[PDB]
Design a protein around this ligand. Structure first.
Ligand code: HEC
Ligand code: HEC
Ligand code: HEM
Ligand code: HEM
Ligand code: HEM
Ligand code: HEM
Ligand SMILES: COc1ccc2c(O)c(C)c(-c3cncc(-c4ccc(OC(F)(F)F)cc4)c3)nc2c1
Ligand SMILES: COc1ccc2c(O)c(C)c(-c3cncc(-c4ccc(OC(F)(F)F)cc4)c3)nc2c1
Lengths: 72, 370, 57, 237, 146, 370, 72, 54
């Protein structure tokens, strides 16, 4: 496939600048940072808990594994 | 007029929103080409015979001008070559690219074609874990009725792993990557009929962009970071993912304490050690891989991505934990706490894929009045 | 009619039946050809091969 | 130099095999004459099975010679009777001892000697059977003898064979020629043990290729037949 | 028709003959050479001791009343001693574990970190006891395995 | 939707008149694929070390089940692989296909890529003519000023042909055919933009025909006859094109009487032995091959074929005799009759190509009032 | 490229039969043979003479090579 | 074959001719090679110092 006839679009406008005429790091710390935390809280409760659960079964299985090998 | 084909690298329509997760497709194109150059220069000084192989690596790592870096850019150049896959696959499952059946079923055929090649490649240094790795793992085919005693001896070229087993791996090893390179160009070919997917799962014909200034430099970045994490291991922790017993030459009359494959197989191995029945263990092993070919026939949500499927997100990242578990159990020995865990995780792997994740999208459809 | 016409009507018409002939032919051909070939070679090299003299030892 | 003559060997035929009975005699030659001074590293007593000796006969010969095998648990190496897996025992431990024991000259190996010398077995029979005094004007150094079938006609190979140099088992008269015939037959088996099995496939091939070539040539001139028979014309307005 | 289709049919027979062979040649190439098959069979050999010896690139292992005193039913793999040996003072066994391919250590029987002196199993993960090859005693001192 | 690419094998337009001479393009596709399978199965039992290589061939030819046939289907599978070229090229010169510059210049790059691969492949058995072949022929680069003493030692990995020279050939040898396979698909690609030539040299757009029933079965025939002439040598004269001194292991302290490469190089070698000046001999050697890239810039006749160019026919078949001469002189020793002949023939080779054959078509144009 | 628009042709006719309705070897010896001899004489004088010349320089060079090695 | 003073190209002389003599000279036990002993034992050099000093 190629550009030109991929689909049909109408009454849509795009504006853009030349990269030599704008900063590459605008508000990199000023605005980017809370977006990350926003991007973080939006998803973290869905990523964390199985890995949180992993760390526990890792230790509990590890300790119980140790205790099994010790003695009466 | 080749360079009409370079339009797949220059003027190619591609979406605009795709984040780092897609770079891992290209990086394999770097690791593979990288690994071929390194392993080649290892061939110049390797010997495929048992009385000379283990030393041959020493000739490289000791006497050769910078022979040693090449071994570790190449061994660990396989480890990183599987971090890339497992994330390159998880994309395809989480963002729902498996609807490109023609590619996915070939994505599988690349995986197997590889994940046997490392097995062969791990033998060639001819140490304990090399030998004993291949000794255990070939015998699993012996479990098959009426064939296995014949097929295994055939693969070995004898009645146990020995010279002719080694020499043929070196030839099956130093060839398939040139077959893998073909299937990649095939794999892309069916992709460049459809164009890649985005995090949303939505048709991106409207907001396409070229590929020459934008993703190129993005791949140059993503490639650069890859060369970091490779060379760090080469230059700061080369024995990390290794296994030191490998640095003892093969002794078929002295079994090591811990037999195991390397880290990138272990989740498969844990599934096997879970089941006591030998043959039934095998069909679980091969099915842990081939199950990818059952995913699209288990697609149920009328959406594609998982950015917009909350329940499947929670189940997906649970699957990752089950994998990481199986990676851990396989590396660890077999005792009553770890046996129990290895059983549960393996059941989750098949259960979670076949039952819950389909069941989720069905439920998710119902909430959306579908 | 001739034999060739009878063969076509039963065997070479259906490509399914057709193929089974070829496998069946190969088996009896594989057997017949090897027997006849060896007989010629032995007849040429009579009394020179191991089995032709093996009885003595 | 001297181009050797070509002979009516029994196995010169495109389908002719070797006289396995003669291979039996040829081995007895190498064993009683040449095995003391020539190596043959690339043959085993097992390869003789089913060709010139059987299992038991070769096995008996494996138990005639002693072979160095086995790191003892004490940490030493000993000698045992050979077995079938064992290769032909090398007479000397290293080539320098050979050059030492033959006035600097090197008895060559004989695994591939047939296929490592132009003319092949024709050369070898003429070589052994070509010894003579030198002609006038010719003189050689001590140790070295004259033979027209060698470059420079000077070798260290003193007479290995002659009439009744040995005895055969089958009651054959051991003429120098009868001996040199059988040994060359043996060596052609050594350098080409596939010989007798080579031609059988050579026979199977020509019979098949005698069939497939015309048949395929028919399907060709069956499908191309449309074009070899088509016609043309030109009907403008 | 039958004439023309006979040409291709007979041809196909001759192809499959050859195609069967060369494949069978190639596959036979990858199988065991003559060298391995010799050593696989010919295995010659010569108190209260057990030695680990090589055979087919595997280990090969080479009191009586005590072992006989051990009950058969109490084994996880019930076998009598003399059912495993042809003579009571010769235990010929194979250092491969039936649980997964691993070697037990010799000598009061065996232990595997991955049995009795006779080769039978008592405690552990091992599903089966040590296996006994097909051998014979040619003399009062010499032994042939397989 | 690969099989749109199989239209180059099925629905491809092709002319109608083309005789057997064009089949030799396809047969390379068989020899190459044939040779790769054989040489692979030789890798299973080959060892790249000097103390074990020569024996390794014996392991094949003696102990292996039908290992021996594979060696001779493969060695002589290279000889037939050059009868095919030299006729595949002579077509391209006689029928004037070299006007497809993009293919021809790649036809050269396939040739060199090959005719070095056999050189490497002839070393691997590690006999006299193997070793001494490589000893003489590498030293020719030493003739170059300011580099050669450095480059040759680099290629050798040392100061004479030894272990690391062998092991790297085995790796440079068992790889390039997979590079050659690429360039072939490239080589065809520029051909399938133009479609093949005919004996007449005339545009055949009018009398094209498909490829599936017609040339396929023609290639099945032509392939069958090729398997004959190969297997005859394997089954009736395997040492024919060989050289028996190869069946003595390498002895660097014992030079053989007759050093020479195999038959398929010898015309190149005769050109070299002709010139006494060493370096000037080399640039003649490389130029005897590269001159093919000067042909199209020396095309002068306004026709293409040579079915309709009488004088060029007589000169063409004279060139063949000059080649056959050079093949013969190179195999024969260097003495006053053969020195003189080898000089004259070599001059004819460059003279006939550069001067007479262009001059002919100029004359032929004049007779036709052009 | 493909069939259909390769070039332009007009007022040309082709006739052809079914291969099952015609012999595959018509006049194979009766007519084919003299065509070969005709195909032979048409070209042989252009192929022969350099190879004829080769056989002579092969022998003459061979004999002269022999004579060189013999004696005064 | 004879004996000569070693040179730089020569490797470290092996004390014993074969491992069986070693097992013979150490009550069946095998002194291991030490080229890769650091990287052939978990814990590395920490292990070894504690081993001798333990
Ligand atoms: C007395 C020891 C001795 C015996 C017995 C002997 N050889 Fe020789 N042979 C030698 C030596 C020494 C050479 C080295 C010749 C030379 O260096 O020119 C030689 C050379 C040869 C050659 C010629 C090699 C060449 O390149 O021309 C052949 C062939 C050969 N041996 C095989 C044989 C044969 C055949 C026999 C009899 C069946 C035989 N050997 C018996 C010692 C022996
Ligand atoms: C008296 C002879 C002797 C000397 C001296 C000796 N070793 Fe040992 N060493 C042995 C033997 C025998 C073994 C075998 C231990 C075994 O089989 O369990 C061994 C074992 C070892 C081990 C442990 C191997 C393992 O897998 O755990 C190390 C490490 C080692 N040797 C290195 C050393 C070091 C370090 C020194 C002191 C700098 C040393 N050797 C001096 C005889 C010796
Ligand atoms: C494409 C998938 C490949 C994978 C997954 C892979 C993996 C491996 C691994 C893990 C090793 C172990 C090395 C060590 O432990 O030191 C190895 C060894 C080796 N590889 Fe790779 N490899 C691949 C491709 C290649 C290629 C393309 C080549 C050559 C061009 C190659 C040549 C070698 C050689 C010679 C060895 C043995 C030498 C040694 O390990 O020191 N491999 N392979
Ligand atoms: C040698 C191995 C591989 C190579 C060379 C390779 C190469 C590529 C490349 C460059 C892309 C484009 C980038 C991207 O879309 O991420 C891609 C896409 C893809 N790959 Fe692979 N890949 C390999 C392995 C795999 C595997 C193992 C799978 C599946 C198990 C797979 C499945 C996919 C899918 C589904 C796509 C398209 C997804 C989309 O565009 O949304 N690939 N491949
Ligand atoms: C494509 C161009 C090739 C050419 C011109 C070529 C030519 C040769 C020749 C003439 C030999 C000598 C063999 C002998 O004298 O017995 C040889 C050896 C060898 N070749 Fe090839 N070959 C080619 C490709 C290959 C391929 C594709 C492979 C493997 C896939 C291969 C593997 C080998 C090996 C291992 C040897 C050494 C074993 C032996 O010589 O017996 N070669 N090559
Ligand atoms: C691995 C080596 C080669 C392969 C795989 C190969 C393959 C092919 C094939 C299949 C064809 C189509 C059939 C034909 O036109 O004859 C072809 C055409 C051609 N080849 Fe190659 N060939 C090889 C070597 C060469 C060489 C060495 C040359 C020149 C020095 C060459 C020059 C040509 C030309 C000019 C054509 C087109 C001529 C025409 O269509 O009229 N090829 N090649
Ligand atoms: C939009 O997502 C896509 C879509 C299609 C793709 C595709 O068809 C190909 C062939 C590739 C690709 C595959 N291998 C290697 C590279 C590569 C990129 C930069 C390099 O440059 C350097 F910096 F050196 F790494 C070196 C190699 C790219 N990536 C695609 C990514
Ligand atoms: C009209 O001239 C042409 C024009 C174009 C051609 C082309 O593009 C290709 C790819 C080829 C070709 C290249 N390699 C191998 C084969 C082949 C043919 C039959 C086989 O079948 C078997 F009987 F097994 F040999 C096996 C392989 C064909 N020949 C072309 C001939």
């Amino acid at each position: 496939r190629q550009f030109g006839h991929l689909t049909r679009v109408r009454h849509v406008i795009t504006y853009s600048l030349s990269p030599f005429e704008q900063r590459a790091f605008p508000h990199y710390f000023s605005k980017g940072i809370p977006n990350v935390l926003r991007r973080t809280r939006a998803c973290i409760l869905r990523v964390a808990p199985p890995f949180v659960a992993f760390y526990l079964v890792y230790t509990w299985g590890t300790q119980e594994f140790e205790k099994s090998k010790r003695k009466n | 007029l080749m360079k009409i084909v370079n339009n797949a690298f220059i003027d190619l329509p591609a979406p605009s929103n795709i984040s780092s997760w897609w770079n891992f497709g290209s990086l394999l194109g770097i690791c593979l080409i990288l690994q071929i150059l390194t392993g080649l220069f290892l061939a110049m000084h390797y010997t495929s015979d048992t009385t000379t192989a283990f030393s041959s690596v020493t000739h490289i790592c000791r006497d050769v001008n910078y022979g040693w870096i090449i071994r570790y850019m190449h061994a660990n150049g396989a480890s990183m070559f599987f971090i890339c896959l497992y994330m390159h696959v998880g994309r395809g499952l989480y963002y729902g690219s498996y609807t490109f059946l023609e590619t996915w079923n070939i994505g599988v055929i690349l995986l197997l074609t590889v994940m046997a090649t490392a097995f062969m490649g791990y033998v060639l240094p001819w140490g304990q874990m090399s030998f004993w790795g291949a000794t255990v793992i070939t015998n699993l085919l012996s479990a098959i009725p009426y064939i296995g005693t014949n097929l295994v001896e055939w693969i070995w070229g004898g009645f146990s792993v020995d010279k002719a087993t080694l020499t043929r791996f070196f030839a099956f090893h130093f060839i398939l990557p040139f077959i893998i390179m073909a299937i990649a160009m095939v794999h892309l070919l069916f992709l460049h009929e459809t164009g890649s997917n985005n995090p949303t799962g939505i048709s991106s014909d409207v907001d396409k962009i070229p590929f020459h200034p934008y993703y190129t430099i993005k791949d140059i970045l993503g490639a650069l970071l890859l060369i970091l994490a490779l060379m760090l291991l080469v230059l700061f922790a080369p024995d990390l993912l290794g296994d030191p017993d490998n640095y003892t030459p093969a002794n078929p009359l002295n079994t090591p304490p811990h037999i195991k494959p390397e880290w990138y197989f272990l989740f498969a191995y844990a599934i096997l050690r879970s089941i006591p029945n030998k043959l039934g263990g095998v069909l679980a092993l091969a099915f842990s891989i081939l199950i990818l070919a059952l995913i699209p026939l288990l697609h149920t949500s009328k959406q594609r991505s998982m950015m917009f499927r909350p329940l499947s997100q929670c189940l997906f990242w649970a699957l990752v934990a089950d994998l990481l578990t199986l990676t851990w159990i396989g590396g660890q020995p077999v005792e009553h706490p770890y046996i129990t865990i290895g059983q549960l995780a393996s059941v989750l792997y098949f259960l979670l894929i076949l039952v819950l994740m389909p069941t989720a999208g069905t439920i998710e459809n119902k909430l959306l009045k579908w | 009619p001739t034999l060739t016409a009878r063969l076509y009507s039963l065997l070479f018409r259906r490509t399914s039946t057709f193929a089974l002939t070829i496998v069946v032919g190969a088996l009896f051909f594989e057997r017949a050809f090897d027997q006849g070939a060896d007989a010629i070679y032995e007849h040429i090299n009579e009394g020179k091969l191991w089995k032709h003299i093996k009885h003595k030892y | 130099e001297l181009h050797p003559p070509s002979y009516p060997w029994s196995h010169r035929g495109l389908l002719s095999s070797l006289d396995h009975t003669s291979i039996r005699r040829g081995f007895q030659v190498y064993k009683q004459v040449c095995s003391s001074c020539h190596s043959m590293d690339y043959v085993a007593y097992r390869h003789l099975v089913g060709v010139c000796y059987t299992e038991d006969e070769a096995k008996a010969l494996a138990e005639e010679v002693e072979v160095q095998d086995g790191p003892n648990e004490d940490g030493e190496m000993f000698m045992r009777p050979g077995k079938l897996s064992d290769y032909f025992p090398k007479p000397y431990p290293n080539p320098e001892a050979a050059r030492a024991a033959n006035n600097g000259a090197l008895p060559p190996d004989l695994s591939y000697i047939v296929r490592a010398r132009h003319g092949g077995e024709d050369y070898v029979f003429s070589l052994l059977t070509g010894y003579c005094e030198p002609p006038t004007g010719v003189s050689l150094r001590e140790g070295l003898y004259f033979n027209p079938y060698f470059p420079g006609q000077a070798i260290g190979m003193a007479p290995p064979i002659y009439n009744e140099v040995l005895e055969f088992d089958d009651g054959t008269p051991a003429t120098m020629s009868q001996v040199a015939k059988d040994v060359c037959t043996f060596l052609r088996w050594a350098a080409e043990p596939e010989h007798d099995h080579r031609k059988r496939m050579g026979l199977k091939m020509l019979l098949m290729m005698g069939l497939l070539l015309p048949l395929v040539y028919a399907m060709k001139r069956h499908k191309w037949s449309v074009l070899k028979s088509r016609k043309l014309a030109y009907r403008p307005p | 028709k039958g004439f023309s289709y006979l040409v291709t049919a007979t041809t196909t027979v001759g192809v499959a003959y050859a195609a069967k062979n060369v494949v069978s040649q190639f596959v036979s190439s990858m199988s065991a050479s003559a060298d391995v098959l010799a050593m696989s069979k010919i295995e010659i050999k010569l108190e209260g001791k057990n030695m680990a010896f090589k055979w087919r690139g595997k280990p090969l292992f080479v009191e009586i009343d005590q072992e006989a005193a051990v009950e058969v039913s109490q084994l996880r793999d019930p076998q009598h001693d003399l059912e495993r040996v042809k003579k009571p003072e010769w235990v010929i066994l194979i250092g491969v574990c039936t649980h997964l391919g691993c070697v037990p250590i010799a000598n009061g029987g065996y232990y595997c970190p991955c049995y009795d002196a006779s080769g039978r199993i008592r405690k552990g993960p091992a599903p089966l006891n040590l296996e006994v090859p097909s051998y014979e005693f040619t003399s009062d001192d010499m032994v042939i395995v397989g």
